[PDB]
Amino acid sequence: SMRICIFMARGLEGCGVTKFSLEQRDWFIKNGHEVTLVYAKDKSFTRTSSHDHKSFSIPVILAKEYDKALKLVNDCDILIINSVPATSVQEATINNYKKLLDNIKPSIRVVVYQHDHSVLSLRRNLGLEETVRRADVIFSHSDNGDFNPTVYNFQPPMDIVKVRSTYWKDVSEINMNINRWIGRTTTWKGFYQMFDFHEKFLKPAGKSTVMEGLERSPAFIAIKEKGIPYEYYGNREIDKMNLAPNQPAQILDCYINSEMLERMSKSGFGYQLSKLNQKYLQRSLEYTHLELGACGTIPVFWKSTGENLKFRVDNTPLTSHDSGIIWFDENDMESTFERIKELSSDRALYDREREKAYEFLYQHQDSSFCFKEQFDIITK
DNA sequence: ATACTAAGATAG
Ligand SMILES: O=c1ccn([C@@H]2O[C@H](COP(=O)(O)OP(=O)(O)O)[C@@H](O)[C@H]2O)c(=O)[nH]1
């Protein structure tokens, strides 16, 4: 047994790094370990309430509570750092952050996970080079990437088993006329391809489309400037949502993760159209990818992403397996629509497919396999 | 152009 301190020096953004952090805590605890979740409250974000953490996470203001922070990160056997201060923070914050790195007990094994898989990243990171100099172990999403002592690979795991046994519904309860897209307002999440698809196929067939997570950040202005039809709702107005036929895309903003899993488990189809560049592509799928195969719905993933990510077991393209995963192709959206109405009539098939994906995604990124993988390297 | 990005003010 050991004490682990998970540190998010950037703050709790409420996305994959926060998620990863929560799933990381769950696993250590599940394997009999003490975990303290600490985050720097200097900077504030929006999706702060998207994941449940308030009752156990420990905030700290680096620019003003250095000693509190020092006491915190030095009270453990293993320090895992998942994020670092952003470029928009004050000198005192980044500076005091760097001062923490220099005063971490020589005995504490410092493990650093580089969660950003974009060249654009690392630029929005401060004190990154000092974190790397003190790290005892480093993990990244890809070897053939921008980032590149010894850098190991990892996948952001999730307890897919748990999610199923909580939300997985009975086919007879899944409305085949609802298409749900989840992600956020950045172009590579594929929100345009989703708006198109609805306008060209989904809407016509009196089907419905929902898109959760599109925050009205500056990026949202492009959607407006292009005059794309949509009806906007907040989490408290999710009741006014019009799930009728031939309607425009219903857009929900920053959503609660638990609630989303519920609405999804009762949805004929779930869309995750992220299209990341193969440089930073190896084996890592994204949380929203694994949340679809787990809640019990047919997963529509971006075709070229599957063609670029390797399966954890054999190291081969994900698209070269019978996952029951519908690979969305921007250059053949009608064929993709085929495999959809198809499974949307023979609910018997739909259910023999959603079972195939869950097993596939389970074998690929469940915490049971991945964290054990990462734990062996940390303690190697 | 194209791809990626919560910037910033205010009410509660
Ligand atoms: O408004 C939102 C948007 C996303 N998420 C969750 O936050 C995580 C985001 O991680 P992912 O790897 O899917 O993408 P990222 O946002 O980190 O690029 C996923 O578990 C989503 O279900 C959420 O709870 N609310």
DSSP-assigned letters across all residues of A262-304: HHHHTEEEEEE-----GGG-SS---HHHHHHHHHTSEEEEEHH
Identity of the amino acid at A165: S
Cα–Cα distance between A15 and A254 in angstroms, integer?
10
Interatomic distance A353 CA / B7 C1' (Å): 44
Ligand 1 near A253 CB (within 6 A): no
Q: How far is the CA of A183 from the centre of ligand 1 (A)?
A: 6
| SS3 (DSSP) at A86 | strand
Overall size of chain A counted in residues: 380
My answer on whether A146 and A230 are in the same domain is: no
**Residue identifier of the C-alpha nearest atom 6 of ligand 1:** A15
Q: How far is the CA of A257 from the centre of ligand 1 (A)?
A: 8
Cα–Cα distance between A320 and A376 in angstroms, integer?
29
My answer on whether A152 and A189 are in the same domain is: no
Contacts of A224 (CB under 8 A, 6+ apart): none
Closest nucleotide C1' to the C-alpha of A116: B4
Ligand 1 near A180 CB (within 6 A): no
DSSP letter, residue A217: S
My answer on whether A319 and A378 are in the same domain is: no
Q: How far is the CA of A106 from the centre of ligand 1 (A)?
A: 35
**Residue A70: its H or E element:** helix A66-73
Q: Which one of A8, A287, A291 would you pick to mutate in the ligand 1 pocket, going by the greatest count of ligand atoms within 8 A of its CB?
A: A287
My answer on whether A143 and A132 are in the same domain is: yes
End-to-end CA distance of chain A: 15
Cα–Cα distance between A317 and A308 in angstroms, integer?
6
My answer on whether A227 and A279 are in the same domain is: yes
Spatial CA neighbour of A38 closest among A63, A3, A65, A12? A12
| SS3 (DSSP) at A251 | strand
My answer on whether A144 and A174 are in the same domain is: no
Which contacts (CB < 8 Å, 24+ apart) does range A342-349 have? A343/A298, A344/A176, A344/A177, A344/A268, A344/A269, A345/A176, A347/A171, A347/A172, A347/A174, A347/A176
My answer on whether A179 and A247 are in the same domain is: yes
Measured in whole angstroms, the distance separating CA A205 from the mean position of its chain's CA atoms is 31
A4 has which bridge partners? Answer: A35, A78
My answer on whether A64 and A145 are in the same domain is: yes
Enclosing domain of residue A71? 1-156+367-380
Six token digits for residue A148 = 């590149």
Q: How far is the CA of A16 from the centre of ligand 1 (A)?
A: 5
Spatial CA neighbour of A196 closest among A331, A69, A327? A331
Interatomic distance A328 CA / B2 C1' (Å): 22
Interatomic distance A97 CA / B1 C1' (Å): 41
Work out if A254's Cβ lies within 7 angstroms of strand B: yes
Cα–Cα distance between A96 and A9 in angstroms, integer?
11
CATH of the domain at A124: 3.40.50.2000
My answer on whether A137 and A209 are in the same domain is: no
A41 has which bridge partners? Answer: none
**Residue A142: its H or E element:** none
My answer on whether A213 and A320 are in the same domain is: yes
Q: Are A37 and A21 in contact (CB under 8 A)?
A: yes
Cα–Cα distance between A16 and A11 in angstroms, integer?
12
Question: From residues 126-165 of A, which are strand B contacts by CB within 7 A?
Answer: none
* Breaks in chain A (C–N > 2.5 Å) following residue: 148
Report helix angle A287-295 to A16-30, nearest 10: 60
Interatomic distance A52 CA / B9 C1' (Å): 29
Identity of the amino acid at A179: N
Cα–Cα distance between A39 and A72 in angstroms, integer?
10
Q: Where do we find the tokens 């994900």?
A: A318
Identity of the amino acid at A110: V
| SS3 (DSSP) at A175 | strand
Cα–Cα distance between A171 and A168 in angstroms, integer?
9
My answer on whether A44 and A164 are in the same domain is: no
Six token digits for residue A239 = 């009741």
Work out if A315's Cβ lies within 7 angstroms of strand B: no
Q: Specify the number of domains making up chain A.
A: 2
Question: From residues 201-220 of A, which are strand B contacts by CB within 7 A?
Answer: 215-219
Structural method: X-ray
Q: Which residue is the nearest neighbor of B7, CA to C1'?
A: A218
| SS3 (DSSP) at A252 | strand
Closest nucleotide C1' to the C-alpha of A120: B4
DSSP letter, residue A201: I
Six token digits for residue A180 = 């749900």
My answer on whether A130 and A226 are in the same domain is: no
